[PDB]
Symmetry: C2
Subunit: 120 residues, 2 copies
């Protein structure tokens, strides 16, 4: 049954990147209302919504530092603690932990996952 | 395209448990030849094949000790090292690492995943 309440990684149209969020409504004809984890909402096409929670091991992602830098990295681990998700991301042979909200996908990285994980 | 070469967790008919393996052939009409990671093969119905690599965070699984004991546990982490998969499994509040081949699903545990992950 129905996609509502599912955690996903969904495209944000203005910038092309995919962000963690939840489907809150099936708006019809292939469209879905999304509440991103930052609290932004919008309608998103099913084809721009990736059914991956968590983002997959061995995936190239975009990691966010606290001073607003970013970089690519490869997911090498997932960890649950106190109900929260953490990613282990490798960059130049070094692994570092990131919170769920510090990991996003560029247009190119999300697009890679569409055939396996998209709701298109 | 085609399911061949996909890593999966598939039911072994005699005992009801699901084991790690790969689809090697589409035998037709919903059936698939499987090469389990131990090297056993058989044909398996798509409905008894779970498209999860790895087995999902927060899933109840069956963990295998080296002296042939087993127990239930909950997946709390995934880790890649040197190309290999490792699970962190929690039992009574304690976490322990297991190799891929030391983690299976009982009939009840695999059956839980069928709606989300089955090829039925």
């Amino acid at each position: 049954n129905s996609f509502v309440g599912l955690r996903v990684v969904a495209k944000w149209s203005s910038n092309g990147y995919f962000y963690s969020g939840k489907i809150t409504r099936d708006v019809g004809a292939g469209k879905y209302k999304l509440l991103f984890d930052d609290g932004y909402e919008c309608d998103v096409l099913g084809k721009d919504i990736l059914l991956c929670d968590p983002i997959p091991l061995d995936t190239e992602v975009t990691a966010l530092s606290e001073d607003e830098y970013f970089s690519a990295g490869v997911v090498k681990g997932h960890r649950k603690e106190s109900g929260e998700l953490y990613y282990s991301i490798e960059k130049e042979g070094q692994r570092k932990w990131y919170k769920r909200m510090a990991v996003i996908l560029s247009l190119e990285q999300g697009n890679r996952l569409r055939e396996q994980y998209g709701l298109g």
